[PDB]
Design a protein around this ligand. Structure first.
Ligand SMILES: CCCCCCCCCCCCCCCCCC(=O)OC[C@H](COP(=O)([O-])OCC[N+](C)(C)C)OC(=O)CCCCCCCCCCCCCCCCC
Ligand SMILES: CCCCCCCCCCCCCCCCCC(=O)OC[C@H](COP(=O)([O-])OCC[N+](C)(C)C)OC(=O)CCCCCCCCCCCCCCCCC
Length: 456
C-alpha cells in the first residue's frame, strides 16, 4: 500500500514506450514468411489451367502510428491503426501449353492490430510480469498490381480464390509475432528493472515491487520497497513509509516519488555499519591552521590538559551514535546531523587517554540532483551547536571549543561526506534507459522527480 519509492508512468511515457516497442515489432513483422498460393481455373487466356502466386517477400511493413491505452484496473491495450504492407513476388499461369509468368506487387491496406497486456508482479522475487491476453488483426483492403496489362483475369482469380485465405493467414501470423514478442522480449526487458541493487561494500537498495503495477485513467504506478539494506543485517527499519499522493501530470514521461523513509533507511544502514566515523590526528590538520592537535597547543586555552598530559599528541574521534534523520518539506530536504566528538591524549605506551566528550549538532540542507541514472547530493551546514557531555580535565565552558570545531568540520569532516554524496546512488532504471528534462518539486514527506526518458 505505501511503498518507499514509487515510479509513476504518464500517458506521455507510455506514448514513448509505444513508439519504441512498435519499432522493435516492425522488424519482426517484416520477417513473416508468407506461404505460396496455387490453384486451378476454367476461365481463359484460354480456358484450362493452373496458376500460382509465390516467393513473396515483405518489402515494407508501415506502422504509421500506434498507441498504448490505459484501461483502468485492467491493464494496457496496444494498438496499431492504419498499417500497410507492401509485398513483392512472382506469379505464373498455364493454359494448355501456354506459359505466362512475371512479377507482382501486393498492397495490404488499412490493417488494424490490437493486443491486451496484463501487468503483474511476482511477490517473492519482486520482479514485474507482462502477459498478452488477446490479440486481433484485421485488414481493410488488398490490391494486386502486375506490369503486364493482359492479366486482369488472373488478378480477378486472385480476389475470388486466394485473397480471403491470404488475409486470414496474414492476420494469424501477425498476432503470432505480437504474442511471441511479449513473452520472449517484452517481459524479459521489463525484468531488467533492478531488484537488490548493490551500491558498495556496505549497502544496497531494495527496489523490488511490493504490489502489481496498477493502471488508472491517467497513471501506471509501480510501487517499490525503496529501502536501503545491509547484506549482514536483517531487521526492518523501526519507522514506516509515508503516504505519497500527487496529481496526475502529463508534461513529463515518468514521476519518481522518493520518500523520506527511503533516505532515512540509508542513514540507518551506514550508521549501523560503523562507517560514519573519522579519526583526526595532528598530521591531518592543514599547515594553514593555527589549531594544532597537541596538549601543548590545547593548553593555551583549556584547564588541566598541558599539565595533566605534558608534550603529548592529541587525537579527535568523530562519530555518529544514532542514525542521522532527514525530513522533506516543500522547502526541500533537510538533514539533522548529530555527532559525538571525543578528544584523547596519546600516552607513552600509545594508549588513548580520554580528555573530554562533547555532542555537536546542526541542521543542513541537502540539495539532490540527477546524473547518469543515479541520484547525487550536496550537504551544506548551518551553525554548529556544541554541548559538553563529560570531562576528565575539570569543568570548562564548551564555547572554548567552538573555533577548532568551526574549522575541523567544513575543512576535514564535511568533505568526506560530500565525496560520498556526490558519488551517489543508483536509480531503478531498466536496460538502455537514461533520464532527462528533470524537474524536482519537494512535497511534504517526499521528493518528486519528473523526467523524460530516452531509450536506445
Ligand atoms: C528514476 C529512475 C526510474 C526510471 C524508470 C523508467 C520508467 C519505465 C520506462 C517506461 C517508459 C519508457 C520507454 C522504454 C520502454 C519501451 C520498450 C523497450 O524498451 O523495448 C521493447 C522490447 C524490444 O526489445 P529489443 O528488440 O529492442 O531488444 C530485445 C533484447 N535484446 C536487446 C537483447 C536484443 O520488447 C518487445 O517485445 C517489443 C514489442 C512491442 C510490444 C508492444 C509495446 C508494449 C509497450 C510497453 C508496455 C509498458 C509496460 C511497462 C510495465 C512497467 C513495469 C515496471
Ligand atoms: C539526500 C541526498 C541524495 C543522495 C542520497 C543520500 C541519502 C542520505 C543519507 C543520509 C546519510 C548521510 C551520511 C553522510 C555520509 C556520506 C553519505 C553516505 O551515506 O555514504 C557513506 C560512506 C560510504 O561512508 C564514508 O566513507 C563517509 C564518512 C562520513 C564522515 C564521518 C562523520 C559522520 C557523521 C555523521 C553525519 C554526516 C556528516 C555531517 C557532519 C556535520 C557536523 C554536525
Amino acid at each position: 500500500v505505501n511503498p518507499g519509492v514509487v515510479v509513476r508512468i504518464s500517458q506521455k511515457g507510455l506514448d514513448y514506450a509505444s513508439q519504441q516497442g512498435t519499432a522493435a515489432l516492425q522488424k519482426e513483422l517484416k520477417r513473416i514468411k508468407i506461404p505460396d498460393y496455387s490453384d486451378s481455373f476454367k476461365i481463359k487466356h484460354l480456358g484450362k489451367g493452373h496458376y500460382s502466386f509465390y516467393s513473396m517477400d515483405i518489402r515494407e511493413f508501415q506502422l504509421p502510428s500506434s498507441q498504448i491505452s490505459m484501461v483502468p484496473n485492467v491493464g494496457l491495450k496496444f494498438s496499431i491503426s492504419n498499417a500497410n504492407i507492401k509485398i513483392s513476388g512472382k506469379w505464373k499461369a498455364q493454359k494448355r501449353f501456354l506459359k505466362m509468368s512475371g512479377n507482382f506487387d501486393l498492397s495490404i491496406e488499412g490493417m488494424s492490430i490490437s493486443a491486451d497486456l496484463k501487468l503483474g508482479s511476482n511477490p517473492t522475487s519482486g520482479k514485474p510480469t507482462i502477459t498478452c491476453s488477446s490479440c486481433s488483426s484485421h485488414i481493410n483492403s488488398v490490391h494486386v498490381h502486375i506490369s503486364k496489362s493482359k492479366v486482369g483475369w488472373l488478378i480477378q482469380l486472385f480476389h475470388k480464390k486466394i485473397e480471403s485465405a491470404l488475409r486470414n493467414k496474414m492476420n494469424s501470423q501477425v498476432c503470432e509475432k505480437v504474442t511471441n514478442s511479449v513473452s520472449s522480449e517484452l517481459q524479459p526487458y521489463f525484468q531488467t528493472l533492478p531488484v537488490m541493487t548493490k551500491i558498495d561494500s556496505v549497502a544496497g537498495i531494495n527496489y523490488g515491487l511490493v504490489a502489481p503495477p496498477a493502471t488508472t485513467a491517467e497513471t501506471l504506478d509501480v510501487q517499490m520497497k525503496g529501502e536501503f539494506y545491509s547484506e549482514n543485517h536483517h531487521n526492518p527499519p523501526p519507522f514506516a513509509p509515508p503516504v505519497m499522493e500527487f496529481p496526475a501530470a502529463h508534461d513529463r514521461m515518468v514521476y519518481l516519488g522518493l520518500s523520506d523513509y527511503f533516505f532515512n533507511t540509508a542513514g540507518l544502514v551506514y550508521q549501523e555499519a560503523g562507517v560514519l566515523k573519522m579519526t583526526l590526528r595532528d598530521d591531518m590538520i592543514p599547515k594553514e591552521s593555527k589549531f594544532r592537535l597537541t596538549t601543548k597547543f590545547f593548553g593555551t586555552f583549556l584547564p588541566e590538559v598541558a599539565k595533566k598530559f605534558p608534550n603529548m599528541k592529541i587525537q579527535i574521534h568523530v562519530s555518529a551514535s544514532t542514525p542521522p534523520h532527514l525530513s522533506v518539506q516543500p522547502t526541500g530536504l533537510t538533514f539533522y546531523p548529530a555527532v559525538d566528538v571525543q578528544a584523547f591524549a596519546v600516552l607513552p605506551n600509545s594508549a588513548l587517554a580520554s580528555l573530554f566528550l562533547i555532542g555537536m549538532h546542526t541542521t543542513g540542507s541537502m540539495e539532490v540532483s540527477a546524473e547518469s541514472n543515479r541520484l547525487v547530493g550536496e550537504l551544506k551546514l548551518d551553525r554548529l551547536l556544541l554541548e559538553l557531555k563529560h570531562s576528565n580535565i575539570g569543568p570548562f565552558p564548551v564555547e572554548l571549543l567552538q573555533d577548532i570545531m568551526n574549522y575541523i568540520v567544513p575543512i576535514l569532516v564535511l568533505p568526506r561526506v560530500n565525496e560520498k554524496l556526490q558519488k551517489g546512488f543508483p536509480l531503478p532504471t531498466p536496460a538502455r534507459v537514461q533520464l532527462y528534462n528533470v524537474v524536482l518539486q519537494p512535497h511534504q514527506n517526499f521528493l518528486l522527480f519528473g523526467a523524460d526518458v530516452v531509450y536506445k
